[PDB]
Design a protein around this nucleic acid. Structure first.
Ligand code: ATP
Ligand code: ADP
Ligand code: MG
Ligand code: ZN
Ligand code: ZN
Lengths: 609, 163, 309
DNA sequence: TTTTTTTTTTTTTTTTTTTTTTTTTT
DNA sequence: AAAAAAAAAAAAAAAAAAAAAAAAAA
């Protein structure tokens, strides 16, 4: 009957229409609405999409809804709310929450169970509508749609810390020490005039207790117009976004998001002291829904086990990591062994012993090493792909820098620290400067980086693995001259790499034809897992820790001695790491003869080059 | 009338020329000096798939000698270097950009470098090619930094925030 | 005057906890008070786990939720315990006492700081990146009326220089023009430290978040830059005192050298209405106040023989 | 090898003016 | 109702000079 002042929305019909919508709607009505042909009605027409989500939310206890606009328009009688929400979002959403308040009761007592409902009474619910209408950029927003729901798209530039907002004031009397709480409306606090206590009753005896009030959380986000839609010779524009309650700390910096929210405009004061305002408002949006652009199940465990039970797991993931790369199976073997890494240990007396494998690729200038590095970048969980051509001498480690937004101090870690526990890929290793090289030296020796600047003395943790690619001086790597002259790298730096591979390119009719054939076949338009590798890698790296047995002793000692029939002691610690990394593959819990045989074969084929 | 004007347009704008109040700070020093502005009321800018363009391509096909004539008409002032003019045409068009599965990508863009002794019409040829395609930028030496200026800081005077 | 009933229950419960715990019968807290008496110390240490077994957490959760309002009663009960069992620790050569809590069950990161824990007892962890000088803070002020020469003492101050309002003698009529007796007033040590998030809690791409932690009393200089420290205390909120009418003309109504953010111009919700503010708008920000700090990241024969067992 | 060459890095705000518009104070 | 006093309002920044390093060569 009665209508909220100003608008035309009435609660009475809206509540009834919404309950009819929820208990009545199914995928049947949705597929009748869209009816785009080839629409599946296989038992979906009776699934009761809303009621099942309602029940699963009740049993979970979480309050999150994804009501859509097209689905809201689907029902004939509730079509009024579709055009009644775009123009008055706040009141319709207030009705929304009020109806969801008893949507719980409508289903908890259908069978008269023993749910408490008291925690339901205390907790509150809300909605997150999306796909309200056609998406329009910030470059087309008039004052004609203020306080109306819109959908925007843009790049996230920055976020601000949590902002307190007062809800309930708290005043204490300095004479009688009486406490009373005053609600605030739209920001303004209505001051208490005199103490309510009739006996006390003193004028001007009020004191505000700042830390005894009640506060809520706010966040402000900054967006930028996407470069695709901008026209020629223009500068991108910006919009500020208000985020409240559960949605705070959701949008990371640099992401691109599409949001739904209410456009709004407020005045800003001309003079700081005076009451005066200037005749030009500022425009922003209050957001209600945000969209962007571990915990493996038991079935995943079973499929991992059965795949691990394969006869030849080595070759399959040898070919999977680099589908495009043809031949070069040996370097892929080495990279597959590197991605697991030997076990890591730190006993009290001896100290920490390294368990990371370092690989250097070098050779003729027009092979495919860069694509190989960009392949291994994606597979590994946490890693960084940055070239060593330039940048700061401590660009891979901590660099104390002045903050840009605030005139303060921030400690920013580098790329080696940010690749902790993973594989760090370095490109153009030969162009890295003589002064920054020493930094890597402390990374590959002690696995820690120390910074002592601006009154800060501290140490970080590197614990990463280095895969690097380099280029020689000239157009070919002539085998006659030894490695040292061509690669332009210090002998210790080359020596400390666990595996060094030489990629050669010789004019061979068979090889040239075979390469060109599959290259053209790839350009011609006509056994590789997609994400199994990442989960298998995580499982092997986070749960599995092999050990060594005397069977490895017998082979390892005699193999090292036979290699000593100019193999430094580094060689044996390289064989142990490779053998223990192979043991982590073909899932096991202990090393045997096969692992040490594969490791020695790999390290001697490396010697052959 | 809002949004009728965009940066980089030569236009003839009509309106009322009015004095701004110049109040607030720094008004006292001026005393009787005022700003000014123009309230705009009219705009006169000085300067697709349809059957017309469907027939233009057919006419040019019936003309014949498309390759040689297209190369030749590029900068008719400069006499010679006809093979260079053939190659600039291939640079104007673009090769296939095919997105191969599993992450592989192949480029179709053209990289053409023109070396040679000074005083051979080096730097008219280039400028002239910029006219043909609307999406093009002529970047020069260290006088300005635009090739690698992918900066994340912009001290715009209007608001003093980064862009 | 209006008094509280829950505060009285907390005050008596704390006295019972101090007097009765004795679990090792050793009277561990009475042993600590004796050690303070003999060594002349000014701070006590209370473990949470020790308190986590009396009243089945009824006292512990009550203290944790509303530490800010219950601290005055805890100190009042401690005063009575000290008077009953060790009067010597009641006067100096009175010692402003401090209570240090530690061993909380769960630890928080800097990105879990929300306004709904303001006033609660928490523990946080972070890496120190800046420390300031040990400045003296005004604790108990003392003034003299200009005309009567009457002396007022123990004028509490919250966040700004607060002078008394009514003269001790109602015969005098005076609203202002006092003279601080800097000699009689009590002072305390004050330090501000800046901390940021740890290297592991930082996401893959992130600009680290920061916080302002206030160390006071005996806790000064215990956190050094570059170290990783675990703080514990109470989460508070700090207003902008410049627009609260500071006495001097030196503030000059928010003099600035840099430009404030235009994005948050009018977006930062400021409350108005209060008479002290006038037509101004008061703003708030979240800071931390710490009571206990821990770190998580002599060739003389006679003195050497003493330390060893 | 000891000479020349080269980037580059803070250096910056402490002051102003008479109106115009606000609060106190006889 | 009519006086005397007291702050806001700054904003701004490129362009040049001097000194110490970290890469080049007769
Ligand atoms: N083939 C040619 N046809 C016509 N004019 C030519 C030709 N070759 C050179 N020129 C002349 O050379 C000039 C255009 O090139 P210009 O010498 O100005 O620049 P550039 O080749 O980039 O050399 P620089 O190194 O001096 O900048 C004009 O004077 C033009 O007449
Ligand atoms: N063995 C190969 N398999 C597939 N493509 C190859 C192979 N060798 C060379 N290529 C081609 O040559 C190019 C190599 O470029 P890249 O290796 O990234 O440059 P860089 O020499 O700087 O590492 C790629 O575009 C790739 O298509
Ligand atoms: Mg030229
Ligand atoms: Zn009262
Ligand atoms: Zn007096």
């Amino acid at each position: 009957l009665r209508i909220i002042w100003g608008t035309n929305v009435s609660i009475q019909e809206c509540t009834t229409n919404f309950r009819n919508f929820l208990m009545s709607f199914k995928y049947k009505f949705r597929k009748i609405l869209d009816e785009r042909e080839e629409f599946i009605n296989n038992t979906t027409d009776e699934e009761l999409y809303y009621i099942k989500q309602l029940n699963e939310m009740r049993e979970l206890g979480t309050s999150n809804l994804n009501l859509d606009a097209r689905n809201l328009l689907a029902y004939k009688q509730t079509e009024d709310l579709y055009h009644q929400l775009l123009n008055y979002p706040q009141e319709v959403i207030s009705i929304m929450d009020q109806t969801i308040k008893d949507c719980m009761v409508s289903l908890i007592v259908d069978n008269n169970l023993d749910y408490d409902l008291d925690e339901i009474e205390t907790k509150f619910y809300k909605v997150r509508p999306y796909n309200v209408g056609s998406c329009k950029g910030m470059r087309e927003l008039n004052p004609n749609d203020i306080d109306k729901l819109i959908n925007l798209k843009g790049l996230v530039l920055r976020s601000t810390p949590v902002i307190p907002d007062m809800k309930v004031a708290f005043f204490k009397c300095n004479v009688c020490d009486h406490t009373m709480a005053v609600e605030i409306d739209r920001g303004v606090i209505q001051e208490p005039a005199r103490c309510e206590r009739i006996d006390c009753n003193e004028p001007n005896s009020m004191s505000l207790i700042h830390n005894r009030c009640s506060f809520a959380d706010k966040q402000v986000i900054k967006l930028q117009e996407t470069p695709d839609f901008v026209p020629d010779g223009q500068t991108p524009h910006s919009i500020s976004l208000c985020v409240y309650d559960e949605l705070v700390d959701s949008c990371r910096a640099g992401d691109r998001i599409e949001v739904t929210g209410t456009f709004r405009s407020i005045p800003i004061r001309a003079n700081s002291r005076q009451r005066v305002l200037k005749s030009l408002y500022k425009t922003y949006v209050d957001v209600v829904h945000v969209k962007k652009v571990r915990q493996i199940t038991d079935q995943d465990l079973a499929k991992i086990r059965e795949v691990a039970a394969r006869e030849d797991l080595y070759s399959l993931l040898a070919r999977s990591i680099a589908p495009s790369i043809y031949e070069l199976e040996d370097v892929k073997k080495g990279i597959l062994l590197q991605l697991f890494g030997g076990t890591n240990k730190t006993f009290t007396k001896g100290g920490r012993y390294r368990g990371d494998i370092n690989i250097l690729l070098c050779g003729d200038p027009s092979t495919s090493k860069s694509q190989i590095l960009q392949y291994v970048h994606k597979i590994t969980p946490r890693g960084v792909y940055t070239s060593g051509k330039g940048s700061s001498a401590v660009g891979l480690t901590a660099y104390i820098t002045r903050d840009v937004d605030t005139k303060q101090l921030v400690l920013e870690s580098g790329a080696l620290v940010l690749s902790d526990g993973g594989v760090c890929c370095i490109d153009e290793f030969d162009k890295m400067s003589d002064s920054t090289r020493s930094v890597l030296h402390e990374v590959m020796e002690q696995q820690t980086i120390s910074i002592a600047k601006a009154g800060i003395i501290t140490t970080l943790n590197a614990r990463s693995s280095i895969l690097a690619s380099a280029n020689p001086i000239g157009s070919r790597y002539n085998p006659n001259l030894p490695v040292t002259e061509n690669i332009d790298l210090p002998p210790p730096l080359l020596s400390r790499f666990d595996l060094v591979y030489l990629v050669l390119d010789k004019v061979d009719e068979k090889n040239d034809r075979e390469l060109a054939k599959h290259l053209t076949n790839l350009y011609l338009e006509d056994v590789l897992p997609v994400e199994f590798l990442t989960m298998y890698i995580s499982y092997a790296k986070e749960h599995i820790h092999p050990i060594i047995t005397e069977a490895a002793k017998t082979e390892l000692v005699r193999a090292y001695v036979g290699m000593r029939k100019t193999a430094t002691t580094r060689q044996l610690e390289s064989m142990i790491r490779l053998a223990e990394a192979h043991a982590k593959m073909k899932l096991k819990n202990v090393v045997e003869l096969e692992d040490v045989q594969e490791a020695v074969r790999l390290i001697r084929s490396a010697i052959k080059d | 009338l809002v949004r009728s004007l965009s940066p980089g347009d030569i236009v003839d704008v009509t309106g009322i020329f009015l004095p701004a109040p110049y109040t607030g700070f720094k008004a006292l020093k001026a005393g009787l000096l005022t700003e000014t502005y123009l309230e705009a009321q009219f705009v006169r800018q000085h300067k697709s798939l349809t059957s017309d363009v469907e027939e233009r391509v057919m006419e040019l096909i019936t003309s014949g000698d498309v390759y040689n004539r297209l190369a030749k008409s590029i900068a008719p002032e400069i006499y010679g270097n006809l093979d260079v003019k053939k190659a600039l045409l291939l640079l104007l068009v673009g090769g296939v950009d095919k997105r191969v599965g599993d992450g592989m990508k192949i480029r179709g863009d053209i990289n053409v470098c023109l070396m040679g002794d000074p005083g051979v019409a080096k730097s008219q040829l280039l400028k002239a090619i910029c006219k043909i395609s609307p999406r093009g930028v002529y970047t020069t030496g260290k006088g300005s930094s635009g090739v690698g200026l992918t900066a994340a800081v912009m001290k715009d005077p209007v608001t003093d925030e980064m862009i | 005057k209006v008094d509280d009933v829950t505060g009285e229950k907390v005050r008596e419960a704390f006295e019972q906890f101090l007097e009765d715990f004795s679990v090792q019968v050793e009277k561990v807290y009475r042993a600590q008070i004796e050690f303070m008496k003999i060594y002349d110390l000014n701070t006590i240490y209370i473990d949470y786990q020790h308190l986590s077994m009396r009243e089945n957490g009824a006292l512990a959760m009550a203290i944790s939720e509303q530490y800010y309002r219950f601290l005055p009663f805890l100190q009042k009960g401690l005063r009575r315990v000290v008077r009953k069992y060790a009067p010597e620790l009641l006067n100096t050569s009175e010692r402003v006492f401090q209570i240090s809590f530690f061993n909380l069950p769960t630890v928080h990161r800097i990105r879990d700081i929300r306004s709904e824990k303001i006033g609660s007892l928490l523990s946080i962890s972070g890496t120190v990146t800046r420390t300031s000088e040990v400045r003296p803070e005004l604790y108990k002020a003392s003034f003299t009326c200009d005309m009567c020469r009457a002396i007022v003492d123990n004028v509490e101050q919250s966040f700004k220089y607060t002078e008394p309002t009514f003269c001790p003698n109602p015969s005098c009529e005076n609203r202002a023009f006092w003279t601080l007796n800097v000699t009689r007033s009590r002072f305390l040590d004050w330090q501000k430290v800046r901390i940021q998030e740890n290297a592991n809690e930082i996401p893959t791409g992130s600009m680290p978040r920061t916080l302002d932690v206030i160390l006071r009393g005996d806790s000064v200089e215990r956190a050094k830059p570059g170290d990783r420290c675990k703080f514990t205390g109470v989460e508070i909120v700090v207003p902008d005192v410049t627009q609260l009418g500071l006495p001097g003309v030196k503030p000059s109504s928010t003099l600035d050298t840099r430009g404030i953010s235009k994005t948050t111009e009018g977006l930062n919700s400021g409350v108005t209405g209060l008479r002290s503010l006038g037509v101004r708008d008061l703003t708030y920000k979240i800071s931390f106040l710490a009571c206990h700090v821990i770190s998580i990241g002599e060739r003389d024969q006679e003195v050497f023989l003493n330390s060893l067992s």
